Design an enzyme around this catalytic site. Structure first.
Site, PDB file in Angstrom:
ATOM      1  CG  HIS A  19      -1.692   1.229   1.520  1.00  0.00           C
ATOM      2  ND1 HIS A  19      -2.620   1.740   0.623  1.00  0.00           N
ATOM      3  CD2 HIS A  19      -1.756   2.044   2.614  1.00  0.00           C
ATOM      4  CE1 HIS A  19      -3.204   2.804   1.163  1.00  0.00           C
ATOM      5  NE2 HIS A  19      -2.723   2.990   2.383  1.00  0.00           N
ATOM      6  CG  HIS A  49      -0.188   5.727   4.656  1.00  0.00           C
ATOM      7  ND1 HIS A  49      -0.754   4.979   5.678  1.00  0.00           N
ATOM      8  CD2 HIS A  49      -0.465   7.034   4.886  1.00  0.00           C
ATOM      9  CE1 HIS A  49      -1.369   5.844   6.483  1.00  0.00           C
ATOM     10  NE2 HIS A  49      -1.236   7.064   6.006  1.00  0.00           N
ATOM     11  CG  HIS A  86       2.476   0.313   5.119  1.00  0.00           C
ATOM     12  ND1 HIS A  86       1.378  -0.494   5.242  1.00  0.00           N
ATOM     13  CD2 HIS A  86       1.996   1.597   5.213  1.00  0.00           C
ATOM     14  CE1 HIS A  86       0.300   0.257   5.452  1.00  0.00           C
ATOM     15  NE2 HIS A  86       0.637   1.544   5.411  1.00  0.00           N
ATOM     16  CG  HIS A 120      -2.565  -2.697   3.759  1.00  0.00           C
ATOM     17  ND1 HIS A 120      -3.519  -3.382   4.487  1.00  0.00           N
ATOM     18  CD2 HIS A 120      -2.852  -1.374   3.935  1.00  0.00           C
ATOM     19  CE1 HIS A 120      -4.283  -2.492   5.134  1.00  0.00           C
ATOM     20  NE2 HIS A 120      -3.936  -1.253   4.795  1.00  0.00           N
ATOM     21  CG  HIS A 168      -7.520   2.962  19.263  1.00  0.00           C
ATOM     22  ND1 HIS A 168      -6.827   1.763  19.290  1.00  0.00           N
ATOM     23  CD2 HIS A 168      -8.352   2.984  20.365  1.00  0.00           C
ATOM     24  CE1 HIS A 168      -7.240   1.106  20.390  1.00  0.00           C
ATOM     25  NE2 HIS A 168      -8.145   1.815  21.026  1.00  0.00           N
ATOM     26  CG  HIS A 173      -4.919   5.491   7.184  1.00  0.00           C
ATOM     27  ND1 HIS A 173      -4.733   6.679   6.500  1.00  0.00           N
ATOM     28  CD2 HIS A 173      -4.618   4.500   6.310  1.00  0.00           C
ATOM     29  CE1 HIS A 173      -4.325   6.391   5.272  1.00  0.00           C
ATOM     30  NE2 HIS A 173      -4.247   5.069   5.121  1.00  0.00           N
ATOM     31  CG  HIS A 212      -6.812   2.667   2.625  1.00  0.00           C
ATOM     32  ND1 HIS A 212      -6.140   1.697   1.909  1.00  0.00           N
ATOM     33  CD2 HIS A 212      -6.467   2.483   3.923  1.00  0.00           C
ATOM     34  CE1 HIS A 212      -5.454   0.935   2.750  1.00  0.00           C
ATOM     35  NE2 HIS A 212      -5.622   1.386   3.989  1.00  0.00           N
ATOM     36  CG  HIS A 268      -7.076   0.204   8.897  1.00  0.00           C
ATOM     37  ND1 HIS A 268      -5.805   0.324   9.441  1.00  0.00           N
ATOM     38  CD2 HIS A 268      -6.894   0.319   7.542  1.00  0.00           C
ATOM     39  CE1 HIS A 268      -4.920   0.555   8.467  1.00  0.00           C
ATOM     40  NE2 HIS A 268      -5.557   0.588   7.293  1.00  0.00           N
ATOM     41  CB  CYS A 269      -6.914   1.073  14.694  1.00  0.00           C
ATOM     42  SG  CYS A 269      -5.592   1.679  15.786  1.00  0.00           S
ATOM     43  CG  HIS A 270      -1.803   2.939  10.123  1.00  0.00           C
ATOM     44  ND1 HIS A 270      -0.662   2.177  10.117  1.00  0.00           N
ATOM     45  CD2 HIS A 270      -2.002   3.280   8.825  1.00  0.00           C
ATOM     46  CE1 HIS A 270      -0.193   2.081   8.868  1.00  0.00           C
ATOM     47  NE2 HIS A 270      -0.982   2.752   8.048  1.00  0.00           N
ATOM     48  CB  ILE A 271      -2.199   0.198  16.583  1.00  0.00           C
ATOM     49  CG1 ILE A 271      -1.867   1.594  17.185  1.00  0.00           C
ATOM     50  CG2 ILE A 271      -1.514  -0.911  17.389  1.00  0.00           C
ATOM     51  CD1 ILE A 271      -2.465   1.905  18.522  1.00  0.00           C
ATOM     52  CG  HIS A 297      -4.952  -2.094  18.096  1.00  0.00           C
ATOM     53  ND1 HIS A 297      -5.050  -0.840  18.671  1.00  0.00           N
ATOM     54  CD2 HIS A 297      -4.271  -2.887  18.962  1.00  0.00           C
ATOM     55  CE1 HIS A 297      -4.449  -0.899  19.839  1.00  0.00           C
ATOM     56  NE2 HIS A 297      -3.982  -2.118  20.050  1.00  0.00           N
ATOM     57  CG  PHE A 302     -10.158  -1.132  16.044  1.00  0.00           C
ATOM     58  CD1 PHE A 302     -11.530  -0.972  16.182  1.00  0.00           C
ATOM     59  CD2 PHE A 302      -9.347  -0.357  16.837  1.00  0.00           C
ATOM     60  CE1 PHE A 302     -12.057  -0.081  17.076  1.00  0.00           C
ATOM     61  CE2 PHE A 302      -9.898   0.568  17.708  1.00  0.00           C
ATOM     62  CZ  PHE A 302     -11.251   0.696  17.858  1.00  0.00           C
TER      63      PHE A 302
HETATM   64 CU   LIG Z   1      -5.827   0.824  17.795  1.00  0.00          CU
HETATM   65 CU   LIG Z   2      -0.393   3.118   6.109  1.00  0.00          CU
HETATM   66 CU   LIG Z   3      -3.508   4.098   3.691  1.00  0.00          CU
HETATM   67 CU   LIG Z   4      -4.942   0.315   5.493  1.00  0.00          CU
END
Ligand SMILES: [Cu+2]
Ligand SMILES: [Cu+2]
Ligand SMILES: [Cu+2]
Ligand SMILES: [Cu+2]
Ligand SMILES: *[C@@H]1O[C@H](CO)[C@@H](O[C@@H]2O[C@H](CO)[C@@H](O)[C@H](O)[C@H]2NC(C)=O)[C@H](O)[C@H]1NC(C)=O
Ligand SMILES: *[C@@H]1O[C@H](CO)[C@@H](O[C@@H]2O[C@H](CO)[C@@H](O)[C@H](O)[C@H]2NC(C)=O)[C@H](O)[C@H]1NC(C)=O
Ligand code: NA
Length: 499
Positions: free
Chosen positions: A65, A67, A110, A112, A397, A400, A402, A452-455, A458, A463
């Site tokens: 992905h 980002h 990164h 994905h 949290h 993010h 897309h 989604h949460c980007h942790i 998670h 999440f």
């Molecule tokens: Cu999170």
């Molecule tokens: Cu990302």
């Molecule tokens: Cu993204």
């Molecule tokens: Cu994503």
């Protein structure tokens, strides 16, 4: 050197020791972080990703992905596994061929797939602006002015329990740093500046989890970009940066020639700076080659506060100036229990058929789409508001979206919304108990967009939800190349999956 906008990128396994401890990794371009992919605004990127992975302990499939890049008309190139594609299998390659109209700033790339990016597949992605409105504020902006902040684990990601509080073993700044336990005096990164020059430092969080308190002893930092969005100048002495966020700041090399500590304190893992953990070195040309002797203050007098940021351009806010003042006002119920996260009562588990392929095959409402309850349709050409009230365990949290950036109408730790001039960005901390962080955007980009949460731990624990934006126009807006149509047959054959 930077690579791109047209380049091959090989994904390999190799041993690395960025904190002195050797472990195998998943790498782009043979390094951690991966090489910087760069071009200019509006360029055509064609990144032909060669999957050369062979170690099953970090997964031999992959997907990448880009980002923060909107992918308008190229949803198939976005990268999230089982949302926009099936993974690339080992021994195969895939050309991510897209354009970056109307964007210029600091991004990253990164893996994905699952938690694979934690195992090393992460690097910077910079879209320069030949007519940058901030160009006169600095002298130097190049690969030497990118600063990455990373969490690093000694345990491999596929051995991290799902839904657990997983903690790192080192902070890495530009790929180097020291381990929190069994600390060894392994090499620290050096960022070199010339007395009197001004630098555009491009600060990139490539974290899988922690947020960092980032500062430079003796120096302040003048923010000019937030997640790709040019800002008014805001001078601060500390930046709290959450996973996947980016800032550009001007560093004025206006202190005496010498060595200064660069500090990145994570919210979990090792606290402080003993033995040179959580540290890198700012070295002026002509300084002695030795560690800094500088001190942090006990408290920082001018920390970044998100409501202080404002766009450089007159971006405004879409919709009406009150809660629910949008064509499609949403409130998500964000929860955690028993090792799993949920959104609106449903924990995300990736489907067998990627969401985009389900829509291209004719499924055309969100109740026809899998996973059931994990896909929300959005109407076309409409103002969307999404309230993200915090409280779920494991915060704060960083959410993010897309395909989009968004106005941050309400930020963490402040109950007052801003319908006039808030910053726009792509990843936002949703804060703490009782907060009501809220975002707005307009739907002008047909396709399925992950939220989604980007942790990353998670996300793996569920999440997430998918916004199926303008289902009726997704197929006409996003023509797909044959190589994309070939991915799911190849993946399913290799894995003995029937669909
Ligand atoms: Cu999170
Ligand atoms: Cu990302
Ligand atoms: Cu993204
Ligand atoms: Cu994503
Ligand atoms: C966050 O703000 C949203 C609106 O953006 C609030 O949503 C309202 O919630 C109440 C029930 O709690 C409903 O009666 C309304 O229909 C919702 N929409 C409105 C008023 O526009 C939500 O309650 C807020 N959450 C928190 C924790 O403050
Ligand atoms: C809490 O957030 C609000 C909204 O973003 C901030 O209020 C703005 O404050 C600025 C700077 O003084 C004023 O120019 C604006 O008119 C305010 N807007 C609104 C809608 O009130 C406020 O400063 C933030 N609180 C803190 C402590 O930073
Ligand atoms: Na407006």
């Amino acid at each position: 050197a930077q690579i791109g906008p047209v380049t091959d990128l090989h994904i390999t396994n190799a041993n690395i020791s960025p904190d002195g401890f050797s472990r195998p990794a998943v790498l782009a371009g043979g390094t951690f972080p991966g090489p910087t992919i760069a071009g200019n605004t509006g360029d055509n990127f064609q990144i032909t990703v060669f999957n050369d992975l062979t170690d099953p302990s970090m997964l031999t499939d992959t997907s990448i992905h880009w980002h923060g890049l909107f992918q308008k008309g190229t949803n198939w190139a976005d990268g999230p596994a089982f949302v926009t594609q099936c993974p690339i299998i080992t021994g195969q390659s895939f050309d991510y061929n897209f354009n970056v109209p109307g964007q210029a700033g600091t991004f990253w790339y990164h893996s994905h797939l699952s938690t694979q990016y934690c195992d090393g597949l992460r690097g910077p992605f910079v879209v320069y602006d030949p007519n940058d409105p901030n160009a006169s504020l600095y002298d130097v902006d190049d690969d030497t002015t990118i600063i990455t902040l990373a969490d690093w684990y000694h345990t491999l990601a596929q051995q991290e329990p799902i839904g657990a509080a997983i903690t790192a073993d080192a902070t890495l700044i530009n790929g180097l740093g020291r381990s929190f336990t069994n600390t060894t005096a392994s090499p620290l990164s050096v960022i070199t500046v010339q007395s009197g020059k001004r630098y555009r430092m491009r600060l990139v969080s490539i974290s899988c989890d922690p947020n960092y308190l980032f500062s430079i002893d003796g120096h302040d930092m003048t923010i000019i970009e937030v997640d790709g969005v040019n800002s008014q100048q805001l001078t601060v002495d500390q930046i709290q940066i959450f996973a996947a966020q980016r800032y550009s700041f001007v560093l004025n090399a206006n202190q005496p020639v010498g060595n200064y500590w660069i500090r990145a304190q994570p919210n979990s893992g090792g606290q402080g700076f003993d033995g040179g953990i959580n540290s890198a070195i700012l070295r002026y040309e002509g300084a002695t080659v030795e560690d800094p002797t500088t001190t942090a203050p006990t408290t920082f007098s001018n920390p970044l506060v998100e409501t202080d940021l404002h766009p450089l351009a007159d971006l405004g806010v879409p919709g009406q100036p009150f809660r629910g003042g949008a064509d499609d006002p949403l409130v998500l119920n964000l929860a955690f229990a028993n090792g799993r996260f949920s959104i609106d009562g449903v924990s995300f588990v990736p489907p067998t058929v990627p969401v985009l392929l389900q829509i291209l095959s004719g499924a055309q409402n969100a109740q026809d789409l899998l996973p059931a309850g994990s896909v929300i349709s959005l109407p076309s050409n409409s103002v969307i508001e999404v309230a993200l009230p915090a409280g779920a365990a494991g915060g704060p949290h960083p959410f993010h979206l897309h395909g989009h950036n968004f106005a941050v109408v309400q930020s963490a730790n402040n109950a007052t919304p801003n319908y006039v001039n808030p910053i726009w960005r792509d990843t936002v901390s949703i804060g703490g108990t009782g907060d009501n962080v809220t975002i707005r955007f307009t739907t002008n980009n047909p396709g399925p967009w992950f939220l989604h949460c980007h942790i990353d731990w998670h996300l793996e624990a569920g999440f997430a939800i998918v916004f199926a934006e303008d289902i009726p126009d997704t197929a006409s807006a996003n023509p797909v190349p044959q190589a994309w149509s070939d991915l799911c047959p190849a993946y399913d054959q290799a894995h003995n999956i029937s669909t």
